[PDB]
């Protein structure tokens, strides 16, 4: 168990190409913890009278020597430049504390705005749904459906929100992927885990990625539809991206 | 070598042009080509009947796939434009001529408004190359005419 | 994967001959046409098309008429309920699928022209699901277009408009002209010169509400001076280009880009061209008596000034690809939004061989372009292997030898020094006795550097596009008797050492029926996970009812993804 201290929270675009620098005071000998709430951003790029969807996701996090952090990312195809918008919360293991200001088992029917602003954690049990988070709302979709329609779904979950009443304490971090990983009896952070480009129904079908929790195992699943671009104009290679940024896991003591 | 400056057959310096679509893109190209060569074009209803007549026939344009990528997607196209025509020498018989133009290009993904401007330029250039071929076949008609 | 097809059917007002169809994708389908002679200038065709997988009948209605206004055709396909659509598209409450198509053409007097091209669909997935006979889609949208024209020998005036049918589930970007006016006027023999005027007024509207809009007016007066001789000719041309833009809806684009668009933009620039040409000839008696060889040098100088066009959005201009004949072209983009500067001279030589009948047999062409100044269009972003900008950069070639009345050979090369190697090249040799006997050889090449400079940026990173093209093909055809015919084609990729296409067809023709069997193994996609291609095997059984002739060739040869083309 760890008790990180709140430092700041950012929601802004990168200053330079795929690089977002956030300045904040830091102390020597401290483990900086960054909880990305918006690690992905599908930017439309212009290439010679073509408007092309292109996910931009964070790749690595670097500490700027006791003065801040920087986030460096990349696009799906490694060919286009842009300024993506990323959000998160910067903390420090070594002085305000985030407090549990919301804890309720809720019923989310397709979408639900957060009752109180903060960093949401949740756990549920359903294999046919996926849960995402765009910053203000929780998005629940039908992940077992193969098509270009934005088919919603419902799920019962335990929702906990921390903002800056028990202190925020976490025990492990997890890198989500295409294979199941058991998190035990614990709550996982809610966010988009990547983006998908697919050849589906004569379109370049673009979706976001969410979290699938069946039992206690978590992996990546398809989520909210971003857009459909006709393949009569241009055709894109298929992409399925899971971000390398870790997600926080907190004990189920809230 | 024994080169020397070259010295349309002189019997076709005045001729009638019939196309069925005199305001079309092919006939406009042909008239321009029979203007740089000092040929006077007479109206279709000339009282004179001792002049040859060039009658433009059917024109066919075919575009097909020439290459594919490793996913089977179309890489290159090939367009073939065929033009038919006949020249009538009064007293003599009918001498058909034809042209065949080839053009290869890559299938470039573009917005369809920008992409048909590129296709409308390729076809316009293939009309000028087809008109030039029909003028180079006039000396061979005069040779056939003189059995 | 494997697929199979089985078709049977044909090649006063009553029923026609029905045709059936079974495939291992859509199962049984049946067509039952009926014909109706309404009048000498009216008729209809009702064709209930029963689809088994969709579990209902699509009523395909057709109406061809010819009235005083003109001749038109209308179409209305209607499927009362779709079973597959309910599973695949649950967000739609209904399942009705329909398509309305209207065409028209009317020539009042001999100069006026009228046209209509109207299309509507019910859902954004109608075109993908159905093999509609009528109806045209542009970038996935059903388009409605109207046109009025007026054409005499020396004047043109066309006004037209085109619209898209956009659904809320479609994100594709497309511009249309609502409306567009084009005017042409030619007056030659103005003294020693020829004159010509071109004008256009257009309004651009995008399918999306966040893309810029503009109104553009263009004027282009031209004056020539064509001088000709028995051995040479030179043509001097002067041109003027005047354009005006009125751009709105620039808020979304300006905030996301460093280069801002401007409200009012005036682009005014001249153009000067000098094209020369000479022809020599020689009596080629050292090869064969009575032959002639001609040598035809050609040079052209073009000058266009430089205007900064970064504050204009690019609506309808795309880069043009070049061949030998494109070395003398005076435009780099197709459209009126990008007009690159030019300070260059093009030189070329073509040599021909004529036989004793004054019939051309052989010709070869070589050409290049020398740039005195780099061609800039303001918005200059092209990936090149080298930073060279001036000098001799482009080379192109041509060849056409007519070996006999049945043998033919062709070729074409392109050599760019900004890539340091061969850009593109193609060749072809064919023997063709008659319609049923032919053997052909192919080769198509495209360097990896050429694709990086030309194709979109994501091509150079994907393994299915980044390696270029290197393809060898072979087509053959042979009839066994007066009622048999065999065809075959094999295409190979020497970069990957894997085939690209393979076809084999046999047809037995008879007096009253023909039976055709086909097989094709083709590239039909990628894996995206294991990074390898996916092949598709298909067998086709086809029975034709005859009331025709033909041994089946030239139809079997054009059935694969790389169709045969007569290159003789």
Residue numbers in the entry:
A (entry chain C): 22 to 115, 139 to 208, 232 to 321
B (entry chain B): 19 to 25, 29 to 168
C (entry chain A): 198 to 208, 225 to 760, 764 to 784
Authors' text:
The outer membrane (OM) of Gram-negative bacteria is a protective barrier generated by lipopolysaccharide (LPS), a complex glycolipid that makes up the outer leaflet of the OM. Following its synthesis and transport from the inner membrane, LPS is inserted into the OM by LptDE, an OM protein complex essential for most Gram-negative bacteria. Several copies of LptA link LptBCFG to LptDE in the OM, forming a protein bridge spanning the periplasmic space that functions as an ATP hydrolysis-driven conveyor belt for LPS molecules. Once they arrive at the LptDE complex, the LPS molecules are inserted into the outer leaflet of the OM via a process for which the details are not clear, but which must involve a separation of the first (S1) and last (S26) β-strands of the LptD barrel at the front of the complex to allow the translocating LPS molecule to move laterally into the OM from the lumen of the LptDE complex.
Here, we report the generation and cryo-EM structure determination of a complex between Shigella flexneri LptDE (SfLptDE; >99% sequence identity with E. coli LptDE) and the RBP of the BASEL collection phage Oekolampad (bas018), which has LptD as terminal receptor. Oekolampad RBP (RBPoeko) binds to the extracellular face of an LptDE complex in which the LptD barrel has dramatically expanded at the front to form a wide channel connecting the periplasmic space to the extracellular environment. The monomeric particle class gave maps to ~2.8 Å resolution and showed clear density for RBPOeko bound to the extracellular face of LptDE. RBPOeko inserts deeply into the LptDE lumen with a total interface area of almost 1,700 Å2 as analyzed via PISA, with a complex formation significance score (CSS) of 1.00. RBPOeko forms 20 hydrogen bonds and two salt bridges with LptD and two hydrogen bonds with LptE, one of which is between main-chain atoms. Most polar interactions of RBPOeko are with LptD EL3-5 and EL11. A superposition of LptDE structures shows that RBPOeko could not bind to the crystallized, “resting state” LptDE complex due extensive overlaps. As may be expected from the insertion of an additional β-strand, the “laterally open” LptD barrel is much wider at the front of the complex, with strands β1-β12 and EL1-EL5 displaced outward by up to 7 Å. As a result, the pronounced dent in the closed barrel between strands 5-10 has disappeared in the open state, and the barrel is almost rectangular in shape. As a result of the conformational changes, the open state has a wide channel connecting the periplasmic space to the extracellular environment with a minimum diameter of ~10 Å, wide enough to allow passage of hydrophilic LPS moieties.
